[PDB]
Design a protein around this ligand. Sequence first.
Ligand SMILES: O=C1N[C@H](O)C=CN1[C@H]1C[C@H](O)[C@@H](COP(=O)(O)O)O1
Ligand SMILES: O=C1N[C@H](O)C=CN1[C@H]1C[C@H](O)[C@@H](COP(=O)(O)O)O1
Ligand SMILES: [Zn+2]
Ligand SMILES: [Zn+2]
Ligand SMILES: [Zn+2]
Ligand SMILES: [Zn+2]
Lengths: 173, 173
Amino acid sequence: MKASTVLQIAYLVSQESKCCSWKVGAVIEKNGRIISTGYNGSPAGGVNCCDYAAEQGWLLNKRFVLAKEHRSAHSEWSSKNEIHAELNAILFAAENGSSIEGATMYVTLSPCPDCAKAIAQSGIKKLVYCETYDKNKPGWDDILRNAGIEVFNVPKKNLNKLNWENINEFCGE
Amino acid sequence: MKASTVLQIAYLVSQESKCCSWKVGAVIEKNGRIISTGYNGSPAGGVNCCDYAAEQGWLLNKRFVLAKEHRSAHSEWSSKNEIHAELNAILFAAENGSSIEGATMYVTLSPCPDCAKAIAQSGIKKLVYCETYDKNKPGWDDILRNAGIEVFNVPKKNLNKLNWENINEFCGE
Ligand SMILES: O=C1N[C@H](O)C=CN1[C@H]1C[C@H](O)[C@@H](COP(=O)(O)O)O1
Ligand SMILES: O=C1N[C@H](O)C=CN1[C@H]1C[C@H](O)[C@@H](COP(=O)(O)O)O1
Ligand SMILES: [Zn+2]
Ligand SMILES: [Zn+2]
Ligand SMILES: [Zn+2]
Ligand SMILES: [Zn+2]
């Protein structure tokens, strides 16, 4: 399917995320059909990010945003509690038994180093993203290209089938 | 994932359709992840609906709509040339080897009799749709319920993450 189409599907998927910092969505497409999806969040039996941020007082009203002064505390907690969108999409394929070899991954946000190295080793041959992650540095995609993975970008401006008024991505103050 | 979310994903999927009468999208979800998708269209090596309608003069400008006087000619051609969204989603699972047993199907439009009977026999246990197909009659879903399939409806009004200005469903005059 068209890149703009799947990317926007990844954006709808991201809305299911309970993370108070960023809402990320990932879609795995094989031969034109979606065979897996994922969004960033905690595992089973684990408290959701938004609920934990509430208890910790990391949020600020108007509709809650993660306070800049607490983003650091969120990153530390998230690193060891929230599975990223890309990995969740891949994890479901392993758990369900769906081969993603040769597939294409669409993700709302450019993958962090942990996700990039996993993607490079997953069998995925193409990665398409929209926004560039907050904490990413230049050349972050080298590991993907060296693995033989094509990396493409589609700007938000080409995505006009979504009512952006109701799509939340970055949720920090 | 939330019904409203997957239904809207089915709507984005429907935009890939080249049919001049209706744009239909179907999504198969298993344990919360999308494992298959489909939209109505011709098979490989087969001329697309919009292109065939153009040659036949079935269309009317403003952005082309299927003329009411030609919908009958379209239905006859479509019946033997276009695979419906629901069946395409199921066909890919059979071709790719992805079990849809116990899965849930989301489809923009209520399935026609051909699709309903196939769904009833597919192993799918839940069907969620948005709009009621033009040519459907009451009790059309009995075959699904008798097969033990739950049937739910979500009105368009609950779907507000899409910019409906850019989503085409019914394309007739
Ligand atoms: O799931 C993805 N995909 C990309 O690889 C990067 C981060 N995200 C995540 C993890 C976390 O929930 C959030 C980033 O928030 P922080 O930047 O505050 O750690 O988005
Ligand atoms: O794919 C689906 N899913 C539902 O079962 C019903 C019809 N559709 C199709 C087939 C055809 O392309 C179109 C209906 O157009 P007509 O009503 O003009 O035949 O939508
Ligand atoms: Zn979080
Ligand atoms: Zn990551
Ligand atoms: Zn058609
Ligand atoms: Zn049908």
